[PDB]
Design an enzyme around this catalytic site. Structure first.
Site, PDB file in Angstrom:
ATOM      1  N   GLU A 134      -9.869  25.588   9.497  1.00  0.00           N
ATOM      2  CA  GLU A 134      -8.691  24.811   9.284  1.00  0.00           C
ATOM      3  C   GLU A 134      -9.144  23.295   9.058  1.00  0.00           C
ATOM      4  O   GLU A 134      -9.752  22.799  10.137  1.00  0.00           O
ATOM      5  CB  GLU A 134      -7.717  24.867  10.404  1.00  0.00           C
ATOM      6  N   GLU A 139      -1.509  15.376  10.552  1.00  0.00           N
ATOM      7  CA  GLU A 139      -0.411  15.845  11.447  1.00  0.00           C
ATOM      8  C   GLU A 139       0.392  14.511  12.059  1.00  0.00           C
ATOM      9  O   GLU A 139      -0.142  13.657  12.670  1.00  0.00           O
ATOM     10  CB  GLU A 139      -0.764  16.902  12.413  1.00  0.00           C
TER      11      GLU A 139
END
Length: 268
Positions: A134, A139
């Site tokens: 990932e 974020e």
């Protein structure tokens, strides 16, 4: 016609050029998201409780993608957990290995996330490629509801990450995470920013903010597996629901807006 790089930051070599990967890129013009390019329902991940990804919370307006947070009108129980809030999920149905991936995003001003990332899809892969890789480009949250010291500036930084996990027994890969952090210069919900990653090779990941290189990260395991784009607005366990429910903001304040997503290969 090229990625967003300020003068002096384009990492290409003079006999190379950047080529748009059409099936992983979208300016989001029109009235309805293109569901031949993007998956917004039917995906494996329904949401981390208590935030359920709703297809209805995905809209287009004015050449932008809008993922809007909501209070569900009644709770929904799925997999024995209660969901009380709506977020949204947009995943690329087409993948790539390597390249430059960027979006222009303004975060929502709520306790729910605003994200832009890549992940492989290990169960469709073979042998050791079933392990997870990932690559988190950005974020963010808009409202910090946990007073833990590690996250007190989470709403004003580019928070990037690389993860290796789910590794099949016998496969020679390490598990772990390698993070990057840089200052936005403001809250993520106050302005648009351009968040970019040069996924240069299996072991070189280079992050950019507003057209400027921020960092280079060696991921915890080789990133040589095809990955798919994600734009997701979710609840994180470490940023819990505020006492008023967290959804009293205007539609704009509840909305994570992506003006565009552009994906590119570097060719000779």
């Amino acid at each position: 016609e090229a990625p967003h790089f300020k003068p002096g930051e384009d990492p290409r070599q003079p006999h190379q050029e950047w080529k748009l990967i059409e099936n992983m890129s979208d300016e989001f013009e029109g009235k309805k998201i293109d569901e031949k390019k993007w998956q917004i329902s039917g995906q494996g991940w329904i949401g981390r409780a208590p935030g359920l990804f709703l297809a209805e919370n995905i809209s287009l307006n004015n050449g932008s993608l809008q993922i809007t947070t909501t209070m569900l009108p009644e709770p929904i129980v799925k997999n024995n957990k209660t969901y009380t809030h709506g977020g949204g999920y947009v995943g690329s149905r087409n993948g790539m290995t390597y390249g430059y991936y960027e979006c222009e995003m303004k975060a929502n001003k709520t306790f729910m996330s605003s994200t832009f990332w890549l992940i492989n899809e290990g169960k469709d892969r073979l042998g050791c490629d079933k392990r997870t890789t990932e690559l988190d480009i950005q974020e963010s949250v808009g409202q910090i509801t946990n007073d833990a010291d590690w996250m007190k500036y989470f709403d004003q930084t580019m928070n990037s990450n690389t993860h290796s996990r789910n590794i099949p027994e016998g496969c020679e890969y390490e598990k772990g995470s390698s993070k990057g952090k840089a200052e936005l210069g403001g809250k993520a919900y106050e302005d648009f920013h351009v968040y970019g990653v040069w996924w240069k090779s299996k072991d070189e990941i280079i992050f950019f903010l507003d057209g400027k290189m921020q960092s280079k990260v060696t991921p915890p395991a080789d990133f040589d597996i095809e990955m798919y784009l994600r734009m997701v607005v979710e609840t994180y366990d470490w940023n819990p629901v505020p006492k008023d429910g967290g959804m009293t903001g205007s539609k704009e304040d509840r909305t994570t807006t992506y003006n565009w997503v552009r994906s590119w290969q570097l060719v000779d």
